[PDB]
Design a protein around this ligand. Sequence first.
Ligand SMILES: [Mg+2]
Length: 142
Amino acid sequence: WTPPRSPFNLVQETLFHDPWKLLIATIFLNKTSGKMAIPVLWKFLEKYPSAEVARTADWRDVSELLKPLGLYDLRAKTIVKFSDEYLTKQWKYPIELHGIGKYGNDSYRIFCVNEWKQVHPENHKLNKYHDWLWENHEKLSL
DNA sequence: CCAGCGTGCAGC
DNA sequence: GCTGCGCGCTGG
Ligand SMILES: [Mg+2]
């Protein structure tokens, strides 16, 4: 399953190969424009390439990185805790993990596994992609 | 200038 | 069901 590229350019379209990275991106986008958050994302991943690394980070350091995105202490603590549970807690969908809600879970179920037909998003950007998927899945050979 | 917005979430 | 978290960006 390879989710198709869309005219709406969701960053999820390029991150689906690594579910942890995709989920970190949804967190970066919590009430934050992609325009500011995505460049900081690359800086984050460069310094924290994996859940393994992130789960051992000092959140205060992660917060300094996240500063110009707002919600910096909240999300830094979320990211460390999320990463820890991602690796050590038993889970089937990432909504069971701290810091991932319906929007992160819906993203996961559209991009990281083949469950887009069962997903019913309430996120505007996700709906755009999802509606477009329903309209075009035949043409796209899905 | 400056009120509202931007691919939410947990805790209450 | 509501609130705290929070910055730079955005556009009248
Ligand atoms: Mg959760």
